[PDB]
UniProtKB/Swiss-Prot annotation:
The SH2 domain, residue ranges: 4-99
UniProt function note: This phosphoprotein, required for both the initiation and the maintenance of neoplastic transformation, is a protein kinase that catalyzes the phosphorylation of tyrosine residues in vitro. Causes mitotic slippage in addition to cytokinesis failure in the host cell. Phosphorylates and attenuates the activity of host CDK1, possibly causing the mitotic slippage.
Subunit structure, as described in the record: Homodimer.
Organism from which the protein derives: Rous sarcoma virus subgroup A (strain Schmidt-Ruppin)
Protein's name according to its UniProt entry: Tyrosine-protein kinase transforming protein Src
Length: 101
């Protein structure tokens, strides 16, 4: 899908969008790594930080496969988004809602 792909948006810009108070815990967006890789940014919550954002670097295997953890890989970013919206499996929270605006 292209809806959760925000492209060349910076890390602080994605945080300002994800920190939106109407956003359900687990709101996300995929963007290009600021530092040719991609990044999954997810909104989270805890009492110390309150509303916050987690950033995961989406890496690629040399055999062609996207990954974030060590036991799961995908053929596309859409397959990765789909898997993580069903299971958190290592992520702070599972993907629940595509980031607004
Ligand atoms: Cl980055
Ligand atoms: Cl990073």
């Amino acid at each position: 899908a292209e809806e959760w792909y925000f492209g060349k948006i910076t890390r602080r810009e994605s945080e300002r969008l994800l920190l939106n108070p109407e956003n359900p815990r687990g709101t996300f967006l995929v963007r290009e790594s600021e530092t040719g890789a991609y990044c999954l940014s997810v909104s989270d919550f805890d009492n110390a930080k309150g509303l916050n954002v987690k950033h995961y670097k989406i890496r690629k295997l040399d055999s062609g496969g996207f990954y974030i953890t060590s036991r799961t890989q995908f053929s596309s970013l859409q397959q990765l988004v789909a898997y993580y919206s069903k299971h958190a499996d290592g992520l702070c929270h599972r993907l629940t809602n595509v980031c607004p605006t």
